Ligand binder design. Structure first.
Ligand SMILES: CC(C)(C)CNC(=O)Cc1ccc(Nc2nc(-c3ccccc3)ncc2C(N)=O)cc1
Ligand SMILES: [Ca+2]
Ligand SMILES: [Zn+2]
Length: 345
């Protein structure tokens, strides 16, 4: 085949992909069977299942050449922010897009942008935060004036690659579709900037306050402004979904992300950065930080998402609580959350 995947575990990959439409899909096994091409394998899976290749005349070869390229622009050596995360966000977005409240709502084009924005939203992530880049006066921080530095990068890179040889997956869209898709993708990726979370949520609460559904229970969004607000929150939720998965998978994400944060602390030390030293693996509590994050950021977000789509998200939300309660139970420089909240200034 094209993924070079072995006849050995082709049944495995096929059987794992049966839960492609489910929140409890295991992206980790999928990466195993794909030879570490989860982003490409899942995206291809997603696009077939929604028939996006056919609808937009995106040939298989074009899609795969682009997706392979894009996946290569993610750093497998960065602990959390590699192609596996990207793959997980796209699959999570794929699931959200099809909940009963939501499924009839979005146009094929809108569906295309959301899943694509998901795929690209972290491409070429260096392993460090926006603030780290700012404080080191990296070329990126200067290029984007210290505002949504990386998110501006992920977009630029995601669209740039469309120009490589046989990589233009949007080649057969009209001029109007390409600019509609582009405005939407831009919106959704910039939406992933965490310093935008609170204003994201504020607006979502509003969507909920005045939500109306059809006779069928389908949410009603009559202007571009509304459905792009749902979309951008959808992708931010998906971005923030780790703790809503089966505890065993949430544990694997947490190991990865903590590795990546503490590795940012090592880089800050190596470089004699600022002065203010972040707590390390020994002095920090990962358990406290999780519960702080779930209470301060994740749950307030998911609870609101659950209102918008009542009761589509209940099993998701019941798992979040369970998971919070489980990190809770394990609870015994400048800490994880002290750092995340300070540099939200
Ligand atoms: C500010 C920073 C923490 C140094 C770097 N972070 C960034 O550049 C943005 C960023 C990237 C990913 C996440 N996701 C997550 N962030 C946390 C977290 C917990 C306590 C304090 C801070 C963070 N926990 C879990 C996830 C999870 N499992 O999804 C949150 C923020
Ligand atoms: Ca990001
Ligand atoms: Zn992300």
């Amino acid at each position: 085949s094209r993924f070079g995947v072995n006849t050995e575990n082709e049944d495995h990959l096929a059987k794992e992909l049966e839960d492609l439409n489910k929140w409890g899909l295991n992206i980790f096994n999928v990466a195993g069977y794909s030879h570490n091409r989860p982003l490409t394998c899942i995206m291809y899976a997603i696009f077939q299942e929604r028939d996006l290749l056919k609808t937009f005349r995106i040939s298989s070869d074009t899609f795969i050449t682009y997706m392979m390229t894009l996946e290569d622009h993610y750093h497998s050596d960065v602990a959390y922010h590699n192609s596996l995360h990207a793959a997980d966000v796209a699959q999570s977005t794929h699931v959200l897009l099809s909940t009963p409240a939501l499924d009839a709502v979005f146009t094929d084009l809108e569906i295309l942008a959301a899943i694509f924005a998901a795929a690209i939203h972290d491409v070429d992530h260096p392993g460090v935060s926006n603030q780290f880049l700012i404080n080191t006066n990296s070329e990126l921080a200067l290029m984007y004036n210290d505002e949504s530095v990386l998110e501006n990068h992920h977009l630029a890179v995601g669209f740039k690659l469309l120009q490589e040889e046989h990589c233009d997956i949007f080649m057969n869209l009209t001029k109007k579709q390409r600019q509609t898709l582009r405005k939407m993708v831009i919106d959704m990726v910039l939406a992933t900037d965490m310093s935008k979370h609170m204003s994201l949520l504020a607006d979502l609460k509003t969507m909920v306050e005045t939500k109306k559904v059809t006779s069928s229970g389908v949410l009603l969004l009559d202007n571009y402004t509304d459905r792009i607000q749902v979309l951008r929150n959808m992708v931010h939720c998906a971005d923030l979904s780790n703790p809503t998965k089966s505890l065993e998978l949430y544990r694997q994400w947490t190991d990865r992300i903590m590795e990546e944060f503490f590795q940012q602390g090592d880089k800050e030390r190596e470089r004699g950065m600022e002065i203010s030293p972040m707590c390390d693996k020994h002095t920090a509590s990962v358990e406290k930080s999780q519960v702080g994050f779930i209470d301060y950021i994740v749950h307030p977000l998911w609870e609101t998402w659950a209102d918008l789509v009542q009761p589509d998200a209940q099993d998701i939300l019941d798992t979040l609580e369970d998971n919070r309660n489980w990190y809770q139970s394990m609870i015994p420089c400048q800490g994880l959350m002290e750092k995340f909240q300070f540099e939200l200034t």
